[PDB]
Amino acid sequence: DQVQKVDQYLYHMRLSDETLLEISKRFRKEMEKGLGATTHPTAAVKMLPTFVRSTPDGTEHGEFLALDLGGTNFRVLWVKVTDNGLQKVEMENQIYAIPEDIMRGSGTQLFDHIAECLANFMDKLQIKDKKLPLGFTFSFPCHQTKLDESFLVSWTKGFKSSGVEGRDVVALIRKAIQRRGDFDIDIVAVVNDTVGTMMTCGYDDHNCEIGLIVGTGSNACYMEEMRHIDMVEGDEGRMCINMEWGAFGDDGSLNDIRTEFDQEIDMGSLNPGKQLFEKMISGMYMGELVRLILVKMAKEELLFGGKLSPELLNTGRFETKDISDIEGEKDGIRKAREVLMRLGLDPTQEDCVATHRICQIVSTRSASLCAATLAAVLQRIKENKGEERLRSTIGVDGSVYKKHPHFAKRLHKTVRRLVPGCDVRFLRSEDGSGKGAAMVTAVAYRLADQHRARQKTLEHLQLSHDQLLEVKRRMKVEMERGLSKETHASAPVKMLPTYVCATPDGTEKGDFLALDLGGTNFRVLLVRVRNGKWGGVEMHNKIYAIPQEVMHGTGDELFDHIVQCIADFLEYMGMKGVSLPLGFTFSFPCQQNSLDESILLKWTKGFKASGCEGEDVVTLLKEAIHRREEFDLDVVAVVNDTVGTMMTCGFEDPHCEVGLIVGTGSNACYMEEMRNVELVEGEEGRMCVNMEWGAFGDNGCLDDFRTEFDVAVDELSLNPGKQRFEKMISGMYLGEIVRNILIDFTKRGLLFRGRISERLKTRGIFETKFLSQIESDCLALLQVRAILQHLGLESTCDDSIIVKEVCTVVARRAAQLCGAGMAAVVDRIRENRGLDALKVTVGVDGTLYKLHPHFAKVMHETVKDLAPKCDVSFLQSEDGSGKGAALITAVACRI
Ligand SMILES: N#Cc1ccc(S(=O)(=O)NC[C@H]2O[C@H](O)[C@H](NC(=O)c3cccc(-c4ccccc4)c3)[C@@H](O)[C@@H]2O)cc1
Numbered sequence: 066d067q068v069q070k071v072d073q074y075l076y077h078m079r080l081s082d083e084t085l086l087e088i089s090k091r092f093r094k095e096m097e098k099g100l101g102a103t104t105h106p107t108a109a110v111k112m113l114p115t116f117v118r119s120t121p122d123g124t125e126h127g128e129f130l131a132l133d134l135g136g137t138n139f140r141v142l143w144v145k146v147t148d149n150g151l152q153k154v155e156m157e158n159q160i161y162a163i164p165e166d167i168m169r170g171s172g173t174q175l176f177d178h179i180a181e182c183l184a185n186f187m188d189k190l191q192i193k194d195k196k197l198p199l200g201f202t203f204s205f206p207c208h209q210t211k212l213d214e215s216f217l218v219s220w221t222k223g224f225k226s227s228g229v230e231g232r233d234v235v236a237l238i239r240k241a242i243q244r245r246g247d248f249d250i251d252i253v254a255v256v257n258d259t260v261g262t263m264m265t266c267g268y269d270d271h272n273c274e275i276g277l278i279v280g281t282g283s284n285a286c287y288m289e290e291m292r293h294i295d296m297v298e299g300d301e302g303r304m305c306i307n308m309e310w311g312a313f314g315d316d317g318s319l320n321d322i323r324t325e326f327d328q329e330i331d332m333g334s335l336n337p338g339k340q341l342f343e344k345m346i347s348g349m350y351m352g353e354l355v356r357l358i359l360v361k362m363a364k365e366e367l368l369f370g371g372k373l374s375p376e377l378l379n380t381g382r383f384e385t386k387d388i389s390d391i392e393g394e395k396d397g398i399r400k401a402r403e404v405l406m407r408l409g410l411d412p413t414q415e416d417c418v419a420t421h422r423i424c425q426i427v428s429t430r431s432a433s434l435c436a437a438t439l440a441a442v443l444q445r446i447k448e449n450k451g452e453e454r455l456r457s458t459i460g461v462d463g464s465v466y467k468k469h470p471h472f473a474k475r476l477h478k479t480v481r482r483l484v485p486g487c488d489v490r491f492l493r494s495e496d497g498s499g500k501g502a503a504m505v506t507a508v509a510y511r512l513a514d515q516h517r518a519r520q521k522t523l524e525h526l527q528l529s530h531d532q533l534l535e536v537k538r539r540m541k542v543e544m545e546r547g548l549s550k551e552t553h554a555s556a557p558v559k560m561l562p563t564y565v566c567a568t569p570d571g572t573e574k575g576d577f578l579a580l581d582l583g584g585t586n587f588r589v590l591l592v593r594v595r596n597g598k599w600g601g602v603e604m605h606n607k608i609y610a611i612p613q614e615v616m617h618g619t620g621d622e623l624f625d626h627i628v629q630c631i632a633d634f635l636e637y638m639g640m641k642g643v644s645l646p647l648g649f650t651f652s653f654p655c656q657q658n659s660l661d662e663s664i665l666l667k668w669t670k671g672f673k674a675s676g677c678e679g680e681d682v683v684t685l686l687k688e689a690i691h692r693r694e695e696f697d698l699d700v701v702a703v704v705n706d707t708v709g710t711m712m713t714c715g716f717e718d719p720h721c722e723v724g725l726i727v728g729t730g731s732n733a734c735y736m737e738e739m740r741n742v743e744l745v746e747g748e749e750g751r752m753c754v755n756m757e758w759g760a761f762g763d764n765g766c767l768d769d770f771r772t773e774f775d776v777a778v779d780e781l782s783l784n785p786g787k788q789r790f791e792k793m794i795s796g797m798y799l800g801e802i803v804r805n806i807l808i809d810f811t812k813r814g815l816l817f818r819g820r821i822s823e824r825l826k827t828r829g830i831f832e833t834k835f836l837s838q839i840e841s842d843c844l845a846l847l848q849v850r851a852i853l854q855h856l857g858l859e860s861t862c863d864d865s866i867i868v869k870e871v872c873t874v875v876a877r878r879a880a881q882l883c884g885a886g887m888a889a890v891v892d893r894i895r896e897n898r899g900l901d902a903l904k905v906t907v908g909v910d911g912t913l914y915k916l917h918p919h920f921a922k923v924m925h926e927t928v929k930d931l932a933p934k935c936d937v938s939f940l941q942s943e944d945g946s947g948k949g950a951a952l953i954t955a956v957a958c959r960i
């Protein structure tokens with residue numbers, strides 16, 4: 066009953082969950098004030114970059130050194146880290162003392178002392194001939210510009226040493242070590258005690274993204290995304306922030322929470338108006354905060370018969386330790402009586418249950434405020450990872466939480482209410498920031514080892530100028546043997562004659578039909594040509610689908626259906642009754658004997674239509690046109706789609722002798738001298754050749770460039786060992802190469818935390834449109850993370866950087882090999898004519914050339930560098946697939 070009198074007296078120190086969640090919202094604004102460039106100089110929560118770029122993943126290994134300077138004594142530590150799967154850290158340390166002589170003395174004397182102790186420790190500890198990282202955690206206020214550079218703002222706890230404040234403490238420890246000359250030190254890291262706590266816990270639990278200390282002081286750190294950290298340059302990846310939240314409220318943002326006892330401790334402190342959040346929650350001030358509630362209640366005659374004692378009025382005489390005791394004993398109000406008597410009072414039972422209760426109120430308020438600001442931190446980690454349910458572990462240290470009986474549990478229960486959208490685990494750190502500082506340099510080496518590891522794989526996909534010139538000539542060599550009559554049949558690149566013998570001039574006019582047929586949906590095309598200067602080409606299409614009934618039926622039914630569509634189209638343009646010549650794009654394997662004769666070899670892509678294979682496709686087509694009555698169309702020619710792409714850029718540019726398509730497929734064509742084409746009789750004139758160059762390398766001629774990933778794609782394709790040059794440069798394949806690289810890294814622990822999604826094992830997930838967005842993303846790489854979340858993969862910042870890099874390397878090699886092939890073509894076009902300076906144009910189509918951000922560029926420079934004499938322009942075509950078929954006809958019609 067004295068209880069509810071107490072609670073009604075202390076009502077403003079019992080905080081509703083509502084108040085806590087409004088404190089979280091305030092703290093989140095304070096976090097954003099510190100992270101932002103313009104608001105940070107006046108921000109009370111300093112949000113200091115720590116330069117730690119990663120938590121531990123567990124595979125760290127090595128030997129490391131550490132210093133902990135807390136003052137009047139420091140420790141020198143040695144941490145053995147073994148990757149055996151146990152994650153069991155081996156430690157040794159020693160304390161040594163800095164006496165007032167050195168302490169109040171000069172800076173360089175102070176560090177010469179420290180450098181000596183370190184060497185005395187390495188001497189005792191065996192290791193002094195080893196060059197090891199350090200390892201540096203000291204808590205005095207600092208301005209930290211680098212992992213290895215931190216400036217002393219001021220001293221604390223009795224350090225007067227001159228020449229230190231405003232001077233880099235790493236330069237001081239390093240210069241001292243040079244002066245001794247007996248040992249040497251590797252990379253240094255300067256790490257705050259919370260960051261140390263996070264790091265050491267994260268070596269056991271790799272979900273630990275928050276360090277926490279409720280000590281005599283209180284502070285917390287978390288992992289944070291570089292896009293939100295204005296004070297450090299770059300938006301990629303994440304970095305740990307030292308929040309310094311003890312200073313929360315220094316500008317008065319908590320003054321409606323803070324009671325008068327809170328006011329009075331601030332005035333009685335060493336640092337008035339500083340660290341007000343600490344002074345509410347933490348160990349130094351917590352028992353003192355009970356002292357004042359006792360003093361004032363007794364001055365009001367609600368306790369002790371209005372009577373005081375000289376000890377009750379001395380600051381510090383009622384201690385945090387006295388709270389832990391009173392709340393911890395079975396009989397708490399006897400241990401209360403005992404503590405009160407020690408202070409010179411004669412308590413009653415009601416005086417003791419009152420003192421007991423005030424203790425719970427103060428200690429519960431401390432654990433609740435922590436929850437509040439832990440709630441804001443948890444909340445932001447949630448929004449950054451961007452999923453609804455969160456697993457995150459908090460490493461925790463400090464004497465309040467470890468040694469006070471109920472506070473850890475209260476914190477656990479309160480945090481978990483305040484954030485129901487989280488599964489949160491707490492893990493206490495024992496050996497403290499001695500381990501932690503060391504572990505920061507272990508992770509620093511791990512990141513390096515892994516970076517070099519995965520950059521050593523990506524070198525196999527990086528080709529030299531000399532490697533490309535080799536494949537350039539392996540292209541020519543294997544072009545020649547396709548033209549000559551002997552070797553054509555053994556030849557992977559068949560160099561098939563197109564029977565397209567003449568390119569445009571300004572003369573052509575009139576309307577032409579075009580039929581682009583492959584796969585289940587064709588298009589019918591009307592193409593109108595305007596001759597003369599200016600003018601150009603005008604196109605109308607319509608798309609039709611071949612019913613599933615029709616392609617599992619007879620072959621004549623297939624082409625009647627096709628002809629109904631042609632008849633529907635030109636009646637849709639309003640031409641019904643008009644007869645026109647027709648160009649024809651048929652993409653199936655075909656031996657083409659004439660320009661208007663081509664024999665279907667084998668059906669593909671799900672056409673079962675009978676009576677077709679082994680037949681000339683144009684006869685089938687016009688035998689189907691004959692049938693329709695009254696319907697007459699002249700079928701002039703049939704073409705490979707590359708040939709069309711080139712002829713399409715023949716009308717823009719007089720000089721275009723070369724088609725190219727880097728598509729879902731890849732192929733290329735030039736006009737070769739009739740001299741050199743040995744399967745067609747006669748030497749007079751020139752002839753366009755359909756290279757079918759995606760087959761470059763199916764004899765093995767590329768097999769020394771082919772990485773295991775190229776072979777992984779090759780072996781699980783529908784056409785194993787066929788079309789290899791295609792599978793390096795285009796289409797479905799590059800995503801698959803990327804995917805197999807990623808799988809490789811992840812098996813090696815180099816990506817995705819070692820863990821392969823079943824969703825990562827799914828073929829085809831990386832589509833060329835996604836590689837295009839990936840490689841065109843920059844800065845924070847939020848577009849890569851989105852895509853990765855879209856495909857069901859881990860979206861973390863660090864994994865984006867790699868995925869982006871793997872993509873860029875795969876796509877570069879693709880353009881580069883594509884230039885080296887296109888360079889062979891333009892050089893032999895020179896060598897056929899004995900010419901040297903040669904100006905050429907390449908019409909180009911296909912999905913990846915137009916839409917990939919860097920690909921068109923990279924290939925341009927590749928053929929400039931590999932074919933120095935040729936001057937090569939590339940003109941984009943746009944649907945030379947079907948439109949080129951009509952335009953091959955208009956030139957054919959000119960004869
Ligand atoms: N001197 C101490 C000390 C260390 C550890 C402990 S402790 O280990 O017992 N508690 C952990 C936390 O205590 C304090 O809040 C520390 N901040 C401050 O005292 C403080 C106070 C005012 C300003 C700045 C500042 C300013 C600029 C840059 C860095 C720091 C820091 C915080 O850095 C530490 O992480 C206890 C006491």
Ligand SMILES: N#Cc1ccc(S(=O)(=O)NC[C@H]2O[C@H](O)[C@H](NC(=O)c3cccc(-c4ccccc4)c3)[C@@H](O)[C@@H]2O)cc1
Pocket residue numbers: 559583652653654655669705706707726728729730731732733757759760788791
């Ligand atoms: N089916 C398709 C298709 C069509 C267009 C596209 S595409 O329009 O996206 N790219 C254009 C190029 O793709 C591939 O290289 C094509 N080669 C083959 O299909 C191929 C594949 C294997 C063997 C032989 C062969 C070899 C010797 C003789 C005859 C034929 C040809 C090529 O005809 C086309 O020039 C993508 C895919």
